[PDB]
Subunit: 158 residues, 6 copies
């Protein structure tokens, strides 16, 4: 009877584009799980613990959302939660053809459905990679990231 969606990603760091999508999922599904899946072949900026903390600290307003680590196939994580749905955001710059390819693959291997939702226009041009690039060069992306992330970026400059 209880519905549910997983919002998977690398979240290095989580942005307000991601939070917008978490909010939509939390509004439309009984339970939401944010799954952090780190790429074993891309050294990111933030370690796993920091990524988890940034998501948790940025989602306290969503009572029906929790945050977990995923270690293998996203579909294995989804099924482990007793769920069969993934929610993914679309923004300016999304590789949509690759998202579609992954969605079809995920449906084939595990029967998991993927629902795509367009990010709010004001948060439609932030991405983790571009936010880091701009921030590291001294640009102000603070309006595009949650305050828990802004705090950690400010300390990353030190």
């Amino acid at each position: 009877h209880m519905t549910g969606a997983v919002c998977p990603g690398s979240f290095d760091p989580v942005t307000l584009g991601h939070v917008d999508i978490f909010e939509r999922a939390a509004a439309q599904f009984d339970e939401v799980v944010v799954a952090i899946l780190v790429n074993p072949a891309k050294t990111g900026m933030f370690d796993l613990d920091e990524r988890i903390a940034m998501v948790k600290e940025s989602t306290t307003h969503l009572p029906n959302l929790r945050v977990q680590v995923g270690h293998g196939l996203v579909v294995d994580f989804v099924r482990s939660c007793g769920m069969t749905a993934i929610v993914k955001g679309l923004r300016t710059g999304t590789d949509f053809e690759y998202e579609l390819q992954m969605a079809q693959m995920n449906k084939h291997i595990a029967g998991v459905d993927t629902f795509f939702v367009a990010t709010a226009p004001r948060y439609s041009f932030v991405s983790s990679s571009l936010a880091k690039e701009v921030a590291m060069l001294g640009g102000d992306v603070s309006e595009l990231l949650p305050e828990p992330v802004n705090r950690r970026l400010r300390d990353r400059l030190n």
Copy 2:
């Protein structure tokens, strides 16, 4: 804790691509409403009552799905159902940029979220318009349409 999505469209006629999406919505939301909205400036093949019957007859396996007519804004229909979500299918040939434009407009005017889902590959190249075109020229699209639709299409050539 009750969740819900509306699957809106003109469904002239409903295809197995549409049914695939109804199935995904019905699996992931507590209730689904198929909303038939007609373009008052379009040369529809089937009248509204035939469209309703085809959708109903093609969805008897989905116990939490109902079929209704809308006469104005899709967002007004969605809210009249006590819902705030739309589910739309993607296929080969979808005008995705227009779908994105409508999704953003619908969110702006009424706060309604739109979730997009990729149709199953076998049903990814049928559309109402192309099915009608092929059928009228004697082609066999019966594997891409529900039997309630095939029946009526066959009676149109009789």
Copy 3:
């Protein structure tokens, strides 16, 4: 040393997406001409004089912008102004491949350059056609259109 761009379109009616682009052109070129060209085979809502008035009334803050009518090729209009550049806006739902085709054709036939600019995100999902559709069905698009347009749109439902 005098520079200039033409912003052509049907503007039926002008939107805040269009005004955003007029503003960018006016900031970057010495003179801007808004060129209203009407599709002689299109069911326009507003007559040419109403379209001109709406553009003029919506651009009083741009001192280097003027509004004129064109009756043939956009390139012939551009050259009649003593200019060789067109500025076109991009939004969610733009048929960009057609815009690219026209740009290449316009360069071929008359040497006229086309510059494309992305509309501000808040105005990225309004279009003349969708604004009219929503307004006629009772939806509120007033935040996406200039007040001179809202006034006339309200008088059309009166």
Copy 4:
């Protein structure tokens, strides 16, 4: 060991973009058939006999190419020629997603393969529709159309 492709379209009128593709097909297949199929619900400029003549007159340098009319499904035309392949050109402004949809539909209903080829850059921005539009407004598209077409287009303005 005999190979063959059909190049279908409305060719109203044939352009140098189309001729470029005919040339590639003729270089790569033993026989090529240009198939003229008319949209019975389209306001074509040139009648079917004029379209045939323009194609024939523009392809005299291709000895393994013939021109024929089709009246129903393109796949039925292709099979009537003893062939199982279609060659379609891509240009700036092509509705590629619709082309992909038709290709998949054509393969489904008749087993016919579709091969897409990018038009030469110099001919990549002409289309029948845009050429007619520009020509009717007095623009010079003569470098983008075969001389047999230019002749007839000039006689239409006479």
Copy 5:
């Protein structure tokens, strides 16, 4: 008199999407050559010998196809075969703009034509990279790869 196409790629490993395209090329050209071109700057999973063996073992049903190694420009390989045509598959996730760029480049430098064909829907979401990723994480992509490839992936787990 004999027609021919080259199907180039890295094939690390060959998938059923690739085989589908080989089948189309073999049906429409007198001879087909699969050319394996290894990227000297991307350590793949399978060495050149294994890639060749997987393609050969997966194409025994295509009597007019052979498999060869290419060492430099794909167009140099194509011309060395006495051919002037390349056939490339399209799938969900194809970087089509890059494929188009390469096609135009290949035509410019060597006069070689590229024909694109859409993969069968059931094989439209497999790619070499995604199949490896899923397989390495214990997912079942065996329905998307030829048995000669499945055998080698099973041994890669050991």
Copy 6:
């Protein structure tokens, strides 16, 4: 009163596609600055000094253009020139969604406008990366690059 645009890039090496765009910018803005911004995380082929020299040597026909190095955010460079406009070219293979994302980001952080222009068809399929790849394998891309670049590539073979 003086208008201006910056044409930023990595230019490793500059191509005739880039020069085409420099020419358009120089025709439409009082002053143009080509800004070379080297990626600190991608070893290119040519060092910064060589990149600058190739651009300068290839633009002597543009009296109102100068060439400079940028060291951080492109928007910081643009504002340092007393300008607020960037001009970027589009070609076959452009990652347009990423260009749009950067344009929206650049507008957000610094109020800088980006104008996109389509490259001339004959120069629409060259890119720095593809030109290097083809040249290094002995292909002739000399018609797609300025002679100052061709000279340095010939010496790179030695």
